Design a protein around this ligand. Structure first.
Ligand SMILES: Nc1ncnc2c1ncn2[C@@H]1O[C@H](COP(=O)(O)OP(=O)(O)OP(O)(O)=S)[C@@H](O)[C@H]1O
Ligand SMILES: Nc1ncnc2c1ncn2[C@@H]1O[C@H](COP(=O)(O)OP(=O)(O)OP(O)(O)=S)[C@@H](O)[C@H]1O
Ligand SMILES: Nc1ncnc2c1ncn2[C@@H]1O[C@H](COP(=O)(O)OP(=O)(O)O)[C@@H](O)[C@H]1O
Ligand SMILES: [Mg+2]
Ligand SMILES: [Mg+2]
Lengths: 316, 348, 261, 152, 327, 258
């Protein structure tokens, strides 16, 4: 009954988080000081918004965490009566708290809440701010209204640079003494894409699945289109060759890959490909157009063939 | 009172143009089993004239006693939407396209409501009653699917008359069960005929040449022609052939837009013409109408070896404006491509 | 040929109102020993076993075993046609799509024939093993129903602990805490109001309150309720349905995370 | 009699073929009790439900199958209601019989909204040692990347 | 009585009235002895009578006693909602009777449900229909009726038996419409009947509705070519000759004249695409000219399907047929 | 000038929830014979004839024939202020726009005066013909409400058939069928618990159950109900409100065929 590595290697203090260094340092300044403002943390998944908010709440409250901290989440019902009752009478309650430490309402996945939920949120966070402070977590700030981002301090978490993902990955691997190859670990970076929980789960998964951490094992337990094949496809589309890229297309189509994953890996490889900048812009526009062809419901091999033809003709 | 609607015809025998379609519709409504109608044609051709004329021929005297009712509907999301209704004691008339994404909601609920309503003294008047769907072409797909469901389930008690233009966006399987009535735009001679009639009734002596100018500048649109005639009467009662016709502000604004385009081919003139395009777009006029006006006032200037590519790019940017959601990017892309092609044309 | 006569008529109504919202389709397994039923909720958390013995019926005869699919909402409406003192005769064929219930007045004046259409269901007979329990507590039915009805206002769960003092029902919700204790009662004038506790080892388990509120609608069936509770064993709620059978429930306990704070 | 598709659903991990690696890894997971939450994705009709049902019938007997496996799909109404209904109520509780982890089998799992996927991924985090989910889907790209970061 | 339209009135009723569709009779005739069948899907142009064929077929499989109890007939374009797909079929399969009849004849114990015009459903509704077919594969059999193949999705067509329904192809409809004309005392010549056949590509129901409409407008007069051209949605041929004469040689002023003279007439641009395509693929133009014109006609019909403006696109289409015809 | 005083006021309250759901507004017609209500439902199915006789009232003054059309939901709201034992006074003048309702205590310690706004209604009086009904079944109104309530769960309508074996109620629906049967009771202890069948010709008729559920809110008024049927005529159901008056409901049978 061993715990998974996502929850086993969760940080317990605020200096173990490698996401955004200035924001983490200012959060630690507020943890040692006490008067934490209303904060909202935005960014891609896996950057560590939940562990930053949880570690801030723990380092603030301590032993009074079970009564001075309310964690409302997406798996719980968040209707109009919930923001009318649960959040309100948590914000109205009294807790014997120190001079600087304040009550915390951890509102994880605030972008999934309805409009009336945020309508009942706004007055609560403006009025009861002498006692309770809201630490919102979210993925996209567009689904949240502008007034909540106005009354909060917005903390943009970036997608993680691969170096800090490597440092945490050597920390976990040295904690487990799991053998590795280097290129397999770079394959784990490529499978992560700024999602650190995805990197940990894929490493976990892959070792339990197949011993040595080598490109073959991680690319077997994931089964995305291979970076070398799609990179050679885009390279064959660079020098105006429809046929040589079409053997790679038939290789990736007779392997049973769905067209959505094919075009997603095509765009992700085309993001970092070494070619001319205007040519990269035209390629990204055509890959986007074929991706709307896919998303509208035309998932044939001939749409991939037409994508290859358009990338070939745009290179003279 | 304006004469554009004061001298509107009532009976099918006092129509000025399309007499054969008038006789065909009169003999169609003369017998029983009046079918579902889909009336179509260009704007200003006189579709609604035929529709209230058909309503006059189908019923007795009380066909023009109209009033506005307001009906609320509920979306699947908890939100009340108030819709308008032009109604009489013999017929219904709804514009259902005012509700944008909730058009399936009104198309289900409102015609379910008027279908469940019972015709009081139904033996006295006629077998069924008629429902007008004034703007029906820009309804979405499943809204029109619920529309043909509504046409199928109440075929005995409620037939519909759908009025629109450009039926390409109207779905196929509503066109199969609806009798397609096509009203062409009246010709230059028919427009001159009705202008001469509406002037001879009101004690006027309009020359024929000015009637030809009114017809040729009305672009086969009779309401606009009678409004130009009215405005010409207001401007000057002694009518000369060399008369300054009071054109509408948005056409001459498009003419100034077009000559601002062809004057200079620089990004600063592109900024000025983008400001003019924003001023045109802010008046809630459709961008296909702006595109058509830009192409009509643009083809009077360009050389004969460049009209084809200009027309192809006009169709291309109108289509991509229809596929998109914001008009100004596609419009100013069209203007930028025209400036680039024209500066290539005079540069070589 | 399934003819089964039942003189006391509202006890089947109370049996059904116990199954009324807790389960929507169930299968009746019919043998010469009588009527059997074993079903689960749609969430697969609570198990219901209903056994009606052969000798409890007035005239029971049954040639062959019958697996019979039933929607309890349809005969929830049909058993509301039955009176409180009415005699219920159940009739079915060996290859029936039909079910006949005849409601008879005690003075033989009013006769009622009612028909239910049956549905096919796949039956998974989950054989419940005989397990010895660490704790067996018999308590009043109305007392336990009141216990869950008060504790469902505080929170959504109850912590039931059986120890040497007695049985403790606890709840902890956003309104606050709640702890109701019950001790062994030495002397009651009636045997139906006493709380009597037999023990091997003190236990402590957490249960959802929606399920217990669904369970305790079986209050007028029996005056006494037997809760059999143990570690790694479900919460057995036995109602002895007079002398004609028994209604038994099985609740899996909830997961309690261990926190040092 | 029945159509041939329903008469020969491979009932045994022996009858099925051309999926030997999935067979080997899943039996290796289930013999040593290291099975994580599963997300089975591929084309239609390649045997996604058959292998997980044969594995669940390999683990448990027929007399205890009703309390250790809950099967849902999109024939029922799916959204934010039934994730807060049967799924976590099955997931948060213990076993009526014996001991061991449970199983939720969710066929055609790509048909739910991303709010439902966020509710389900938090349900997966909250109860893991007592519940092992199985989500069968056609397209991987309809599933949020955190949910793919939970289940293998 | 009520005035019945002559499509469902004149449809076949029995199994052998299907006008030479004996394969559809024979496959079932085999299924009578086999007492087993998978899901069915009949695709074909309408007026052929797929619904009446399956109604008489289910009457043969169950009988008039079991027809109103074991056959559920629903119209998919009348039941496009995802709720009524996922509730009424579930309620029909949940209410089960035995497969034994009072006549003593053997009967297979699965239900029959019919979904007519299933091609008009969307992707999500057809996916929910696939789910309903998946969960009810033991106690209720599914058959569908549609007019086109690819409008039905690939998972919905992968679990059914596909049957093509051929209509009355040639030389039978003309005298049949003549019998309808003589029965209702309708005067219409041979060329009008031939034009009625020609305006509908293999569709009987379109021809009956056009004849009904033309008789309603005339009321007892002669059915000329003008009335049929008006009802059937046909651009008159002299407009196409005027368009080709303007686009053959000259200036852009005459094209604008004929395009603004084709929109003003009220004609749909898709009809111009269809008829201009018909007169390009049959004429004596060059292969390059025919190819460029037809590819642009396909592109123009694409953007008209997407809701673009007809005026500018008929301008551009006439511009490229001018640039192909003048050169 | 019209005043009416009645010593038992809960019977008019029971009248009120007998027809506050069936009909929304009703015209009360008072002549020297008494009070008559011949009203007609909104969905064009049911007719209601409620009559109250003069002799049962404690005191009664009426000058002219009068017709007041009052909304019964609102005047059901005003009679909910009254108790079950209070003596009730109804006052209205000859040209009354108001209705005065005075509820007095039996010990005369509480006397309550309220006012009701009245409205004008265009009333058509349907002449109910005196005709011989073939079948008359007298049975317990509590059991009759029980019959309508337990048959309403099964289906939307009942085919009821009476013959020499007695009366029979049948309902069909997706849940199944229900078929209750009553015979002629020979020996009873109370006459209100007896079932009496007067026979001329066995008859079968089908009627919607919504209106039967609506009609069975008059069952505290009378211990017995009377169900009267014949061919091609509306069904009569009849409550005897004490010796005070009667309550007849005329039901249109369902003649829909497949
Ligand atoms: N900056 C980080 N440093 C170290 N470990 C991290 C970091 N970010 C994430 N992790 C690990 O990833 C796990 C999941 O992190 P979470 O904070 O839950 O992700 P998240 O920011 O909440 O994004 P969501 O909730 O999926 S949208 C944690 O338990 C850590 O083990
Ligand atoms: N590897 C296999 N070996 C043998 N039979 C197989 C195999 N894969 C599929 N089948 C057969 O295919 C039938 C259907 O399998 P399913 O598992 O129901 O399909 P699926 O993978 O769930 O795809 P869905 O349900 O349409 S998303 C089974 O009953 C088997 O008879
Ligand atoms: N025979 C006629 N006599 C007088 N006016 C006419 C006649 N035919 C058409 N018109 C005018 O032409 C205008 C056409 O407007 P309308 O019927 O709304 O067409 P559309 O619906 O296409 O805009 C009307 O305002 C009407 O007054
Ligand atoms: Mg989070
Ligand atoms: Mg499957």
């Amino acid at each position: 009954y061993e715990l998974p590595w996502v929850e086993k290697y969760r940080p317990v203090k605020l200096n173990e988080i490698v996401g955004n260094e200035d924001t983490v340092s200012r959060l630690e300044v507020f943890a040692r000081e006490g008067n934490v403002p209303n904060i909202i943390i935005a960014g891609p998944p896996g950057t560590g918004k939940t562990t930053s908010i949880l570690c801030l709440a723990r380092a603030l409250l301590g032993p009074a965490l079970k009564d001075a901290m309310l964690e409302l989440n997406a798996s719980n019902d968040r209707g109009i009566d919930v923001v009318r009752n649960k959040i309100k009478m948590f914000a109205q309650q009294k807790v014997t708290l120190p001079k600087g430490r304040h009550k915390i309402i951890i509102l994880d996945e605030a972008d999934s809440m309805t409009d009336g939920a945020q309508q009942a949120l706004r007055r609560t966070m403006e009025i009861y701010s002498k006692t309770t402070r809201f630490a919102l977590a979210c993925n996209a700030s567009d689904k949240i209204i502008e007034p909540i981002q106005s009354r909060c301090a917005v903390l943009r978490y970036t997608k993680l640079t691969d170096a800090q993902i490597l440092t945490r990955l050597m920390n976990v691997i040295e904690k487990e003494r799991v053998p590795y190859t280097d290129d397999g670990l770079e394959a784990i970076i490529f499978t992560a894409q700024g999602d650190m929980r995805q990197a940990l789960n894929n490493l976990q998964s892959t070792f339990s699945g197949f011993g040595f951490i080598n490109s073959e094992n991680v690319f077997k337990v994931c089964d995305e289109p291979h970076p070398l094949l799609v990179k050679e496809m885009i390279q064959h589309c660079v020098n105006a060759n429809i046929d040589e890229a079409y053997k790679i297309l038939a290789h990736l189509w007779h392997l049973g890959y769905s067209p959505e994953d094919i075009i997603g890996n095509i765009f992700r490889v085309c993001k970092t490909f070494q070619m001319a900048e205007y040519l990269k812009l035209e390629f990204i526009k055509e890959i986007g157009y074929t991706h709307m062809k896919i998303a509208e419901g035309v998932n044939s091999l001939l749409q991939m063939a037409g994508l290859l033809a358009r990338l070939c003709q745009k290179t003279m | 009172s304006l004469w554009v609607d004061k001298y509107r015809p009532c009976s099918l025998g006092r129509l000025d143009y399309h007499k054969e379609q008038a006789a065909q519709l009169r003999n169609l409504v003369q017998c029983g089993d009046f079918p579902h109608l889909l009336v179509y044609g260009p704007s200003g051709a006189g579709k609604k004239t035929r529709i209230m004329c058909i309503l006059r021929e189908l019923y007795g005297v009380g066909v023009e006693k109209l009033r506005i009712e307001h009906q609320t509907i509920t979306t699947p999301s908890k939100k009340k939407i108030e819709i308008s209704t032009i109604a009489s004691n013999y017929h219904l008339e709804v514009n259902p396209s005012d509700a944008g994404n909730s058009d399936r909601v009104v198309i289900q609920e409102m015609l379910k409501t008027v279908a469940q309503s019972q015709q009081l003294e139904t033996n006295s008047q006629r077998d069924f009653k008629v429902v007008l769907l004034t703007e029906v072409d820009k309804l979405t797909k499943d809204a029109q699917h619920a529309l043909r469901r509504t046409m199928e389930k109440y075929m005995s008690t409620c037939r519909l008359i759908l009025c629109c233009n450009s039926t390409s966006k109207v779905i196929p399987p509503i066109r199969s069960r609806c009798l397609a009535v096509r009203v062409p735009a009246p010709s230059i001679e028919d427009i001159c005929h009705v202008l001469s009639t509406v002037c001879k009734k009101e004690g006027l002596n309009l020359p024929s040449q000015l009637a030809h100018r009114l017809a040729e500048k009305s672009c086969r649109n009779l309401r606009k022609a009678l409004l130009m005639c009215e405005a010409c009467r207001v401007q000057q009662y002694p009518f000369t052939a060399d008369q300054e016709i009071p054109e509408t502000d948005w056409e001459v604004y498009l003419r100034e837009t077009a000559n601002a385009i062809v004057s200079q081919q620089t990004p600063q003139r592109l900024l000025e013409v983008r400001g003019r395009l924003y001023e045109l777009l802010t008046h809630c006029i459709p961008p296909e109408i702006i595109m058509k006006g830009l192409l009509s006032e643009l083809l009077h200037n360009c050389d004969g070896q460049l009209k084809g590519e200009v027309a192809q790019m006009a169709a291309y940017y109108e289509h991509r404006l229809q596929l998109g959601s914001k008009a100004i990017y596609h419009l100013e892309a069209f203007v930028a491509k025209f400036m680039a092609l024209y500066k290539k044309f005079m540069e070589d | 040929m399934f003819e089964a006569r039942l003189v006391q008529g509202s006890i089947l109504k109370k049996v059904l109102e116990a199954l009324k919202d807790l389960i929507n389709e169930a299968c009746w397994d019919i043998s010469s020993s009588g009527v059997n039923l074993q079903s689960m909720d749609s969430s697969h958390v609570s198990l219901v076993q209903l056994t009606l013995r052969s000798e409890g019926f007035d005239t029971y005869r049954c040639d062959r075993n019958l697996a019979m699919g039933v929607n309890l909402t349809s005969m929830s409406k049909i058993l509301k046609c039955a009176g409180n003192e009415d005699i219920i005769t159940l009739r079915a064929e060996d290859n029936a799509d039909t079910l006949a219930l005849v409601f008879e007045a005690p003075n033989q004046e009013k006769v009622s024939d009612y028909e239910m259409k049956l549905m096919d269901l796949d039956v998974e007979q989950l054989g419940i093993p005989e397990q010895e329990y660490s704790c067996v507590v018999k308590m009043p039915s109305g007392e336990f129903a009141r216990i869950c009805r008060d504790l469902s206002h505080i929170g959504d769960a109850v912590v039931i602990s059986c120890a040497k003092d007695g049985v403790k029902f606890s709840a902890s919700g956003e309104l606050g805490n709640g702890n109701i204790k019950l001790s062994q009662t030495s002397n009651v004038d009636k045997e139906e109001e006493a709380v009597t506790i037999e023990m091997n080892e003190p236990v402590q388990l957490t249960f959802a309150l929606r399920y217990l509120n669904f369970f305790t609608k079986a209050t007028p069936l029996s005056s006494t309720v037997t809760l059999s509770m143990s570690a790694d064993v479900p919460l057995v709620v036995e109602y002895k349905i007079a002398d004609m059978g028994h209604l038994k429930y099985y609740l899996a306990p909830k997961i309690e995370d261990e926190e040092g704070s | 009699n029945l159509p041939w598709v329903e008469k020969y659903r491979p009932q045994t991990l022996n009858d099925l073929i051309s999926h030997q690696d999935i067979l080997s890894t899943i039996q290796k997971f289930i013999n040593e009790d290291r099975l994580p939450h599963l997300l089975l994705y591929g084309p239609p009709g390649t045997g996604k439900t058959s292998t997980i049902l044969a594995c669940a019938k390999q683990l448990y007997k027929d007399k205890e199958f009703g309390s250790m496996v809950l099967e849902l799909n999109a024939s029922d109404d799916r959204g934010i209601d039934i994730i807060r209904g049967p799924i976590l109520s099955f997931a948060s509780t213990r076993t009526i019989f014996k001991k061991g982890f449970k199983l939720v089998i969710l066929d055609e799992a790509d048909a739910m909204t991303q709010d439902a996927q966020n509710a389900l991924r938090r349900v997966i985090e909250k109860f893991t040692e007592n519940t092992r989910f199985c989500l069968i889907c056609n397209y991987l790209s309809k599933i949020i990347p955190a949910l793919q970061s939970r289940c293998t | 009585a009520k005035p019945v339209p002559w499509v469902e009135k004149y449809r076949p009723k029995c199994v052998d009235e299907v006008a030479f569709q004996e394969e559809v009779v024979a496959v079932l005739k085999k299924s009578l002895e086999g007492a087993d069948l998978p899901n069915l899907l009949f695709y074909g142009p309408p007026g052929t009578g797929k619904t009446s064929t399956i109604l008489a077929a289910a009457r043969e499989l169950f009988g008039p006693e079991l027809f109103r109890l074991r056959v559920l007939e629903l119209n998919a374009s009348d039941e496009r909602g995802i709720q009524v797909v996922r509730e009424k079929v579930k309620n029909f399969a949940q209410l089960t009777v035995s497969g034994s009849r009072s006549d003593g004849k053997p009967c297979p114990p699965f239900k029959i449900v019919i979904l007519d015009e299933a091609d008009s459903m969307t992707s999500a509704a057809q996916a929910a229909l696939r789910r309903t077919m998946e969960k009810e594969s033991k106690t209720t059999r599914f058959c569908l009726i549609c007019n086109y193949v690819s409008r039905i999705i690939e998972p919905l067509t992968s679990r059914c038996s596909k049957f093509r329904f051929k209509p009355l192809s040639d030389k039978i409809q003309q005298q049949r419409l003549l019998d309808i004309a003589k029965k209702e005392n309708v005067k219409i010549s041979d060329e009008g009947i031939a034009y009625l056949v020609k305006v509908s590509e293999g569709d009987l129901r379109k021809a009956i509705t056009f004849l009904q409409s033309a008789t309603r407008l005339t009321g007892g007069k002669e059915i000329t070519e003008k009335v049929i051209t008006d009802i059937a949605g046909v651009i008159p041929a002299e407009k196409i000759d005027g368009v080709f004469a303007a686009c053959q040689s000259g200036s852009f002023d005459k094209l604008e004249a004929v395009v603004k003279d084709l929109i003003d007439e009220g004609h749909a641009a898709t009809q111009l695409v269809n008829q201009l395509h018909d007169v390009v693929v049959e004429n004596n133009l060059s292969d390059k000219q025919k190819s460029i014109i037809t590819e642009k006609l396909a592109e123009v019909d694409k953007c008209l399907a997407d809701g673009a403006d007809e005026h500018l696109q008929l301008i551009s289409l006439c511009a490229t047929v001018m640039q192909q015809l003048s050169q």
